[PDB]
A = this chain, B = another copy of it.
Amino acid sequence: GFPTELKPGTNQFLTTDDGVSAPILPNFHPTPCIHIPGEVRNLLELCQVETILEVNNVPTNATSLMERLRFPVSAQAGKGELCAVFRADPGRNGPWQSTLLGQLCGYYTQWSGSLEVTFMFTGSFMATGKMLIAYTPPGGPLPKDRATAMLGTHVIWDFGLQSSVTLVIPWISNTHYRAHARDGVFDYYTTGLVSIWYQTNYVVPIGAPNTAYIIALAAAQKNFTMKLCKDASDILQTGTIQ
């Protein structure tokens, strides 16, 4: 016959080998496809969708788990004081695991693009206030006061009819891509910090509540990408699913 010569890589099963395999059912024509609403051709259509962020991830007990969803803001003196902080690292353990973005970056190592964090105020209509949201890029320590976080990327928002504001976390990196971060030498790929502050105060008249709640909503922008697919750490199985 025709001379052949078997090279290495022979009689091996590589799982990710896009090759041809034999069929079992010849002349099998399957059922046609009707129009079903909601066809999704790529995962980036989902990573551009806001999902609630758990900044208030202090509780653990099963009764107070819904408290993770929102953090309060109350009335204070007016010294310009701290309310909350969190990192801008999606793939890292933290608030970002509640998202559909932070769970789709578990199946992908590296990431890129700009991020966006939208806040919303569930207070009373007759209330007022202003806040100073900030983004402190890598290298710099956690700000101690409001006059230090100000020197970075920051946004100021007045409570009003439009009950929301968008902070935008642009792409500031020496690298084009970022593998996920953790304590060690992989803090070379840390994103930064968010650090919320009071600009004036939380003012409210007689008759209304003294405390309110803020809800957050994390997502991505149109320049987000991911690559080098893998398997996640969370394997939701103890023994045998029976």
Contact = CB atoms under 8 A, between A and B. Distances in A.
Contacts of A26: 16, 18
Contact of A24 (B10, B14, B20): B14
A224 to B, nearest CB: 15
Interface in A148-195: 176-177
A38 interface: no
A234 interface: no
Contacts of A39: none
A237 interface: no
Nearest to A5: B1
Contact of A7 (B5, B25, B31, B229): B5
Most buried by B among A13, A19, A22, A28: A22
A24 B16 contact: yes
Interface residues of A, number: 34
Interface in A9-54: 9-14, 16-26, 28-29, 31-32
Contact of A32 (B16, B29, B176, B227): B176
A13 B8 CA distance: 6
Contact of A19 (B7, B19, B176): B7
A6 interface: yes
Contact of A3 (B19, B24, B25, B28): B19
Contact of A176 (B8, B25, B31): B31
Given A31-B176, A228-B28, A6 B4 contact: yes
B29 A227 contact: yes
A11 B16 contact: no
Contacts of A32: 176
B24 A1 contact: no
Given A16-B23, A28-B227, A31-B176, A6 B8 contact: no
